[PDB]
Amino acid sequence: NVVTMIRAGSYPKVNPTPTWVRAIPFEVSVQSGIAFKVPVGSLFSANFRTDSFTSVTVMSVRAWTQLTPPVNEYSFVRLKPLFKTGDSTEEFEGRASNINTRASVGYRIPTNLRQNTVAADNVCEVRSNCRQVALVISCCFN
Amino acid sequence: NSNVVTMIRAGSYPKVNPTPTWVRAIPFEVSVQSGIAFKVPVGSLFSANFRTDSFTSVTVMSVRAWTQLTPPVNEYSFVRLKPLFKTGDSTEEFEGRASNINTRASVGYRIPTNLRQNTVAADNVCEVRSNCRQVALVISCCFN
Amino acid sequence: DNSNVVTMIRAGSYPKVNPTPTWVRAIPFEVSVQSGIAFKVPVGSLFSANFRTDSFTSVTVMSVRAWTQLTPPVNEYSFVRLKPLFKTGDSTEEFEGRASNINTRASVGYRIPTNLRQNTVAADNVCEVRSNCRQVALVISCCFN
Amino acid sequence: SNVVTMIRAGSYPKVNPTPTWVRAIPFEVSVQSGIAFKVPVGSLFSANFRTDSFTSVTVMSVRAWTQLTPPVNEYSFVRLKPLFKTGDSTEEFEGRASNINTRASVGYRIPTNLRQNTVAADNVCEVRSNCRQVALVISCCFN
Amino acid sequence: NSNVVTMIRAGSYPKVNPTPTWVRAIPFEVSVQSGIAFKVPVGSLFSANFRTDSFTSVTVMSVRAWTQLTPPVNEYSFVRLKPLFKTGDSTEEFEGRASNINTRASVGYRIPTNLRQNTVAADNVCEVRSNCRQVALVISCCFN
Amino acid sequence: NSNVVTMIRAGSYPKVNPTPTWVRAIPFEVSVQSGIAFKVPVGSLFSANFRTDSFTSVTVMSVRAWTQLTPPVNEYSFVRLKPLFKTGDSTEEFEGRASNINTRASVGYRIPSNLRQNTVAADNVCEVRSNCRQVALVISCCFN
Amino acid sequence: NSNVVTMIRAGSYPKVNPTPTWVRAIPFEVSVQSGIAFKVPVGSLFSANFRTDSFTSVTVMSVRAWTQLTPPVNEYSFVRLKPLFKTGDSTEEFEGRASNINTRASVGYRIPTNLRQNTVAADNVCEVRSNCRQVALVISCCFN
RNA sequence: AAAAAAA
RNA sequence: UUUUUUUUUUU
RNA sequence: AAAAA
RNA sequence: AAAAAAAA
RNA sequence: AAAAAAAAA
RNA sequence: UUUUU
RNA sequence: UUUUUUUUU
RNA sequence: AAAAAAA
RNA sequence: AAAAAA
RNA sequence: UUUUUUUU
RNA sequence: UUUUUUU
RNA sequence: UUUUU
RNA sequence: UUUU
Ligand SMILES: [Cl-]
Ligand SMILES: [Cl-]
Ligand SMILES: [Cl-]
Ligand SMILES: [Cl-]
Ligand SMILES: [Cl-]
Ligand SMILES: [Mg+2]
Ligand SMILES: [Mg+2]
C-alpha cells in the first residue's frame, strides 16, 4: 500500500506529441434542400483536446438529425463522401420511422482511402430536412 | 478487403464525450542543482508541448528519472527520488547510480493504487537530487 | 416446390438506402497508339454511357490489362508495354508482353497495391501504352464510386 | 505488397461493357385519399439511380412505407396490389401502424415464374394509403 | 551440382520488364543545426550512389535515424523525427536519447499501409531535430 | 491493421550497403545475319534502360533466346546458342526450331555453378545463329 | 429442372368439390361508441371484399381486436371483448390497454374446440368496448 | 389444422 | 405410402 | 549430386 | 537464391 | 451424352 | 540402357 | 440404362 | 448470378 | 489497431 | 511481402 | 470443400 | 479504460 | 494488494 522502487534501465524511446484515435461529436447547420460540406477543421479544437493537431485520418463518418423535421415529414439525412483524390457520388441515406425519432446513417472509409486531411479539406456533404445534424466522426489524429 | 466505402447501419444516438481521458508517459527535463532537492511541479505535465493543455488534473501512476547531463569530474552519476503527496510527503530516497561515468543514472518508483488521486498544477510530484545539472523525467500518468 | 404466387413480406422499420451505390467493374475500351510514342491512358475514358458509368466522377483502379487490337508490322511480333502512373508519383516500370505468333495478340497487365488504390478523376492518367500495333484493347478492373 | 506487380495475361477474355446489375431502388410516390395509384416501371430508370442506360428490368420484391403523417385521429396504413402484363392480381397486402407517429409497412415477393421483364410503359403495383406520400423500395434486376 | 552446361527446353516468349521495382533501405547523412528542424528531401533517395538514379517515385515504408557526430559538451545525444505527408503533415516527435554520452541516439517510425503512396524528389520525408550536427538515416522504401 | 505512424525502438546502427547486388532477368535484342555467328557482348547488360548502368561485372546463370522476326520464305524459325567462357569456350550448339512458320523459335542453356564467375563488358556471353534477322535474349544473371 | 410441358398419366375420375372449405383471417373494422357495447355481427365476415360472399356459415376459432383511432385527450387506449355464443353468452371482458397514448391497444380471445360451432349472419361473435371510435378486428375463422 | 395428387 | 398457403398454442 | 532419348 | 528493413 | 422412349420380368 | 568417382 | 442438349475430369 | 481462381 | 505499464 | 528459380 | 468485394 | 460499435 |  506504499510506493515501490522501479529498477529502470536505459532511457527509453519517448514521444511528447503522440497520435490519438478519437471520436469527435459536433453539429453542423444545414439548410433544407442544400448540401453542406463538413469541414475537417471542425475536428481540431480545444473543445475536443485536438487543437494541437494539424492533420487527421478519418476512418468512418456518421450523422444524426439534431433538430425536428418539417411538419408532416419523417427525419432523413444523407452523407456523400469527399476525397481529395476524387469525390464520391454515393448518397448514404437514413430515414426515421417515427417523426419524433432521429434519423441515422453513416459510412466507412476503406483502408486504401484513409489518407490525411487538413483543416482546409472537407469530409462529406450533408443533406437533411432538419436544420441541424449531429456527427460523430471516427478518426485518427496525428 | 474492401476497396470502396461501405454503409453503416447506425442506430440510436450513442453516449458521447468530446473531452475524454488520456493515459500518457510525459518526457520532460528538470534542472537540478548540486546538494539540493527540486520539487517537480505537476504543472509541467499540462502543456501544449504534450497536447495536455486542455487538462487541469492528472493521476500519476509511476515516475522514472534519468540524468540528462554529465556528472562532475571524477564522479559517477546518481539520481534520487522522494515521493510527495498532499496527504503526507514521503521520506524515501529511491536512488539509482551509474556504474559508468559516461552512462546515465536511472531510478523510478511506482505509486500504489490507494495513493493514486488527482493532482493539480500547484501540486508537486516528487523531489529530485543529483550531481548532474539536469534530469530527464518520464512520468506515466492518467490525464482527466 | 417453388412458390407460384405473390407472398406477403412482413417488412419493418424503413431501412438504410442508397440510390447511387458503388460498382466493381471490368471496363473494356480501345486506344490508338503510334509507333515509338507512348500514349497516356486517360481516366475519363472509363466514364461513358457505353459503360453505364457516366454518373461516376471518381474511380479506384485495381488492375490494368492490355491486348494488341491490330496486326503488327510486317515480319514483327506484337508487343505492348504498360507504365503505371499515379498522382503521387509516376512509376518507371514497363511491363511488356510479346506474342510468340505473328497472328496472335500480345498481352500483359499490372496490379495496383492496396496502398496505391486511391481515386482518380477524368483529368488523371492511368498508364502509358507502347506498342508496334496501331491500337490496343484495355480491360481495367476498377471500383467506381 | 506495396508496389505494382506484373500480371501474366493470356488470351483476350470475354467482355461485356453493359452488364445487368442487381439493385434496390428507393423512390417516392404521391397518393390520394381513396384512390389507387399505379406505380410506373419507368421510375426505376433514372440518372438518380445510375440506371438511365437500362430499358428493361426484372422485379423480384416490392416494399412500401408511408412517407408522410396520416390524417388526424388515424394510424398509417398502406396496401399493395401486384400488377402483371400477363394478368393483374387482386391481392391487397396491407400493413398498418400501431403508433400514429410511426410509419406503416408491407411488401410482397414476386415468385420465380412471374419474374419477367418490364419496360417503362408498364406498371409495378397499385398503392393505397391514407398518407399523401409513400416510400417504395423495389429489389429488381436490371438488364 | 552439374559440371557442364545443360539445355533449357524454353517455350513461348515470357512477360518481361526491363525496368522493375526494388525494395531498398538507403543509408545517407544530413546536416543538422542546433534548435532547427531539417526537412529530409526525397531526392536524396535518388542517386547513382545507391543505383537508384533511374527512378522518379518511391514508396517509403519506415525511417530510422542515428546521430552521426558527437553531441555538445556535457550532453547526451538525442534525435527527433516528425513524419511528413503530402496529404497532411504529422505533429509527432518520436525522440531517441542516448544513455551513454559516447553512444549514438536512435529512433524510428513506421508508415502504415493506408499512407504508403509514392513521393517525388520535390517532396519531403520528415523533419529531424538533434543536438548533433549530423544524422545518419536508413530509409526502408520501395523504388518504382 | 494499423492506421497511423508508430514508433520503432531502433538500436545500434546496422550493417548497411548503398550499392547492393541484384538478381535480374534482362531482356534485349540482337541483330543476327544469316549463316554468321554473332558474339553477344556482356556490355549490353549494363545499361540505364535496365537500371544497371552502375554495375561493371555480372555473374550469368542461364541464357534463353527467342527469334524476334519472321524466318525466310518456306522455312521455319531456328536459333542456336554456343556458350562462351574466358577460361575456355564451348562447342555446344543448343538449337531450338519452331513447329510453325508464324511462331518463334526458342532455346536456352544453364551455366553450372562451377562456371558461374564474373564477366565484364569487354567479354562475351555466347554466339547466336539464326535464319531470322533479330533474336530476343532473356538472360538470368546476378549483377554485382 | 424442366423447361417444357410433360404428360400426366392420370387414372380414374377423382373426388371433387367446387366449393371447398376455406380458413381465413378476416380484417375488418367496426365503429364503437363511448360507454356502449357494440355487438359484432357475423354477417360482416361474408363479403366480396374477403372473397367470402359465397359462404353462409363460418366457424370462428379466435378473435383479436385493435383500437383503430386515437383515444380521448389525457387517456390511454383500451379495448374490451365479451364472447357471445348461441348456446349462452359469456361475461368475460378480456381487456387490453395501451401503455402509450400514441400506441394501439390490443386484446384477443380463443374459442375452445367444444364451442367452435358454426355461426350465421344473424348471429354475433362478441361485444366490443373502447374509448376509441373505431376498432380493427382480425378474426381467424373457417368458412364453410 | 385446412386445397391437386400419388400404389 | 412423400409436399405449396390463413391463423396458429409449444417444444 | 552429374551426363545422354 | 538474392544486398537492404525488420524479428524470443 | 439434357427430353422423349422398352424394361431390370 | 550408355559414360563417369 | 439408350437417342439429342448441357455440365465435369 | 457478378471482381480475381475454381485444380 | 492506437497511448501507456507488465 | 518485391526480382529471379526447380520433372506436364 | 478453400474463398474474398456494395444488394 | 476511455473512445468508435 | 510488495524493504545472501
Ligand atoms: Cl415534429
Ligand atoms: Cl519513377
Ligand atoms: Cl528480349
Ligand atoms: Cl538415349
Ligand atoms: Cl503486500
Ligand atoms: Mg503478333
Ligand atoms: Mg506449334
Asked whether E96 and A11 are in contact (CB, 8 A), the reply is no
A55-74: b or e for each residue (b if 16 or more CB lie within 10 Å)? Answer: bbbbbbbbbbbbbebeeebb
C142: Cα separation from own chain's centroid: 6
Residues lining strand K, beta carbon within 7 angstroms: E 22-27, 62, 64, 138, 140; F 8-10, 14-17, 20-23, 142
Distance F137 CA to ligand 3 centre (A): 4
E64-77: b or e for each residue (b if 16 or more CB lie within 10 Å)? Answer: bbbbbbebeeebbb
C-alpha angle with apex C6: C4 to C10, nearest 5 degrees?
A: 130
Asked whether D19 and C50 are in contact (CB, 8 A), the reply is no
Strands (E) located in chain F: 6-8, 22-31, 38-41, 57-67, 78-83, 94-97, 106-110, 118-120, 124-130, 134-143
Q: Resolution for this model in angstroms, one decimal place?
A: 3.2
Q: How far is residue D63's CA from residue E35's CA, in Å, rounded to a whole number?
A: 67
Q: Is the CB of C26 under 7 A from strand O?
A: yes
CA dihedral of residues E139, E144, F3, F7 (deg, nearest 10):
-10
Q: How far is residue D123's CA from residue D118's CA, in Å, rounded to a whole number?
A: 8
**Is C95 in contact with E55 (Cβ distance < 8 A)?**
no
CA E55 – C1' K5 distance (Å)?
20
Sign of the four-CA dihedral E94, E99, E101, E106: negative
> Which candidate, B38, B111, B43, places its Cα nearest to that of B79?
B38
Contacts of F23 (CB under 8 A, 6+ apart): F140, F141, F142, F143
Asked whether D131 and D68 are in contact (CB, 8 A), the reply is yes
Q: Which residues of A touch C56 (CB under 8 A)?
A: 89
**Which stretch of DSSP H or E encloses residue E107?**
strand E106-110
List C-alpha distances in Å: A82 to A114, D47, F4.
12, 20, 20
Asked whether C127 and C111 are in contact (CB, 8 A), the reply is no
Q: Which of C52, C67, C139 to mutate to test the interface with D (most CBs of D within 10 A)?
A: C52
C-alpha angle with apex G106: G101 to G112, nearest 5 degrees?
A: 165
User: 3-state SS string over A19-52?
Assistant: CEEEEEEEEEECCCCCCEEEEHHHHCCHHHCCCC
The three-state secondary structure class of F42 is: helix
Q: How far is residue E143's CA from residue E86's CA, in Å, rounded to a whole number?
A: 18
G126-139: b or e for each residue (b if 16 or more CB lie within 10 Å)? Answer: bbbbbbbbbbbbeb
Look at chain A and count its residues: 142
Q: Which residues pair with A139 in a beta bridge?
A: A22, A58
Asked whether C130 and C68 are in contact (CB, 8 A), the reply is no
Asked whether A75 and A96 are in contact (CB, 8 A), the reply is yes
C-alpha grid cell for residue G27? Answer: 380484417
Look at chain F and count its residues: 144
Q: Which of B2, B4, B7 to mutate to test the interface with C (most CBs of C within 10 A)?
A: B4
Q: Which residues pair with G95 in a beta bridge?
A: G80
**Which stretch of DSSP H or E encloses residue A61?**
strand A56-65
**Conformational region of residue B106, where left means phi above 0, alpha means psi within -120 to 50, and beta covers everything else:** beta
**How many C×F Cβ pairs under 8 Å?**
21
Asked whether B14 and B114 are in contact (CB, 8 A), the reply is no
User: 3-state SS string over chain B?
Assistant: CCCCCEEECCCCCCCCCCCCCEEEEEEEEEECCCCCCEEEEHHHCCCCCCCCCCCCCEEEEEEEEEECECCCCCCCCEEEEEECCCCCCCCCCEEEECCCCCECCEEEEECCHHHCCEECCCCEEEEEEECCCEEEEEEEEEEC
Residue C115 carries which DSSP code? G
State the nucleotide closest to F11 in CA–C1' terms.
Answer: K6
> Could you write out the DSSP letters of every residue in chain D?
--S-EEE---SPPP--SS---EEEEEEEEE--TT--EEEEGGGGS-TTTT-TT-S-EEEEEEEEEE-BPPPTTB--EEEEEE--SS------EEEE-SBTTB--EEEEE--GGG--EE-TTSEEEEEEESSSEEEEEEEEEE-
Which structural domain, as residue segments, surrounds residue C46? 1-145
Q: Which of B27, B102, B136 sits opposite E101 (nearest CB)?
A: B102
The amino acid present at F66, given as its one-letter code, is: W
Q: How far is residue F119's CA from residue C56's CA, in Å, rounded to a whole number?
A: 55
List C-alpha distances in Å: G116 to G50, G82, G105.
21, 16, 26
CA C58 – C1' R1 distance (Å)?
39
Asked whether A122 and B14 are in contact (CB, 8 A), the reply is no
Look at chain C and count its residues: 145
Q: Indicate which technique resolved this structure.
A: X-ray
Q: Which residues of F touch E17 (CB under 8 A)?
A: 27
Q: How far is residue G14's CA from residue G75's CA, in Å, rounded to a whole number?
A: 60
CA G144 – C1' H2 distance (Å)?
11
The amino acid present at C106, given as its one-letter code, is: A
Look at chain E and count its residues: 144
In this structure, the strands spanning C95-98 and C79-84 are antiparallel
CA F45 – C1' M4 distance (Å)?
37
Q: Which of C90, C95, C115 sits opposite E57 (nearest CB)?
A: C90
C-alpha grid cell for residue D112? Answer: 420465380
CA D117 – C1' N2 distance (Å)?
39
C-alpha grid cell for residue B92? Answer: 524515501
Residues lining strand P, beta carbon within 7 angstroms: A 6, 12, 15, 18-21, 140; B 23-25, 61-62, 64, 138, 140; E 112; F 1-4, 6-7
Q: Which of A86, A91, A93 sits opposite C119 (nearest CB)?
A: A86
Q: How far is residue A7's CA from residue B84's CA, in Å, rounded to a whole number?
A: 19
State the nucleotide closest to G64 in CA–C1' terms.
Answer: I7
Q: Is the CB of D20 under 7 A from strand O?
A: yes
**Is C94 in contact with E12 (Cβ distance < 8 A)?**
no
Asked whether at least 3 C-beta pairs link B and A within 8 Å, the reply is yes
Only one residue has cell 546518481, namely: B78
Phi, psi angles (nearest 5°) of residue F114: -65, -25
Q: How far is residue E78's CA from residue E96's CA, in Å, rounded to a whole number?
A: 5
Please classify residue B112 by burial: count the beta carbons closer than 10 Å to its beta carbon, then call 0-12 exposed, 13-18 middle and 19+ buried: exposed
Distance E46 CA to ligand 2 centre (A): 10
Q: Name the closest ligand to CA F77.
A: 7
Q: Which residues pair with E134 in a beta bridge?
A: E31
Asked whether E55 and E39 are in contact (CB, 8 A), the reply is no
Only one residue has cell 516528425, namely: E82
Q: Which nucleotides of S are covered by protein (CB under 7 A)?
A: 1-5
Distance C75 CA to ligand 3 centre (A): 16
Establish how many alpha carbons lie within 13 A of residue D47's alpha carbon, considering only the half-sphere containing its beta carbon: 5
E118-129: b or e for each residue (b if 16 or more CB lie within 10 Å)? Answer: bbbbebbbbbbb
Asked whether A40 and A106 are in contact (CB, 8 A), the reply is no
**Is D3 in contact with E113 (Cβ distance < 8 A)?**
no
CA G4 – C1' L3 distance (Å)?
9
**Where residue A13 sits, what CATH number does that domain have?**
2.60.120.220
**Is D26 in contact with A93 (Cβ distance < 8 A)?**
yes
Residue A13 carries which DSSP code? -
Asked whether at least 3 C-beta pairs link G and D within 8 Å, the reply is yes
C-alpha grid cell for residue D75? Answer: 394510424
Only one residue has cell 515480319, namely: C75
Please classify residue C15 by burial: count the beta carbons closer than 10 Å to its beta carbon, then call 0-12 exposed, 13-18 middle and 19+ buried: middle
> Could you write out the DSSP letters of every residue in C36-53?
T--EEEEGGGG-SGGGT-
F65: Cα separation from own chain's centroid: 9
> Which candidate, F26, F10, F36, places its Cα nearest to that of F142?
F26
**Is D4 in contact with E144 (Cβ distance < 8 A)?**
yes
**Which stretch of DSSP H or E encloses residue G118?**
strand G118-119
Q: How far is residue C68's CA from residue G92's CA, in Å, rounded to a whole number?
A: 87
Q: Which residues pair with C135 in a beta bridge?
A: C32
Please classify residue C80 by burial: count the beta carbons closer than 10 Å to its beta carbon, then call 0-12 exposed, 13-18 middle and 19+ buried: buried
Q: How far is residue D73's CA from residue D133's CA, in Å, rounded to a whole number?
A: 18
Residue E75 carries which DSSP code? B
> Which candidate, A9, D25, E69, places its Cα nearest to that of C21?
D25
The three-state secondary structure class of C100 is: coil
Q: How far is residue E5's CA from residue F141's CA, in Å, rounded to a whole number?
A: 15
Asked whether at least 3 C-beta pairs link E and G within 8 Å, the reply is no
Count of CB atoms within 10 A of residue B37's CB? 16
Q: How far is residue F70's CA from residue F88's CA, in Å, rounded to a whole number?
A: 33
C-alpha grid cell for residue D57? Answer: 428490368
B64: Cα separation from own chain's centroid: 7
C-alpha grid cell for residue B32? Answer: 537540478
List C-alpha distances in Å: F43 to B126, C133, D61, E14, F143.
72, 30, 70, 23, 12
Residue at minimal CA–C1' distance from P3?
Answer: B24
List C-alpha distances in Å: C98 to C108, E15, F65.
8, 7, 13
The amino acid present at D29, given as its one-letter code, is: V
Q: How far is residue A121's CA from residue A85's CA, in Å, rounded to a whole number?
A: 12
Look at chain B and count its residues: 144
Q: In what order do the strands lie in the sheet with D37-40?
A: D37-40, D123-129, D77-82, D93-96
Residue G103 carries which DSSP code? B
C-alpha grid cell for residue A18? Answer: 503522440
Please classify residue G85 by burial: count the beta carbons closer than 10 Å to its beta carbon, then call 0-12 exposed, 13-18 middle and 19+ buried: middle
Q: How far is residue A49's CA from residue B18's CA, in Å, rounded to a whole number?
A: 8
Q: How many domains does chain C fold into?
A: 1
C-alpha grid cell for residue D91? Answer: 391481392
Asked whether A142 and F6 are in contact (CB, 8 A), the reply is no
Only one residue has cell 458503388, namely: C22
The residues placing their C-beta within 5 Å of ligand 6, an ion, are C 72, 77-78, 99, 102
Residue C66 carries which DSSP code? E
Q: How far is residue B96's CA from residue B90's CA, in Å, rounded to a whole number?
A: 17
Q: Which residues pair with E135 in a beta bridge?
A: E30, E67
Q: Is the CB of E3 under 7 A from strand J?
A: yes
Count of CB atoms within 10 A of residue G68's CB? 24
The amino acid present at F84, given as its one-letter code, is: L
Q: How far is residue F13's CA from residue F11's CA, in Å, rounded to a whole number?
A: 7
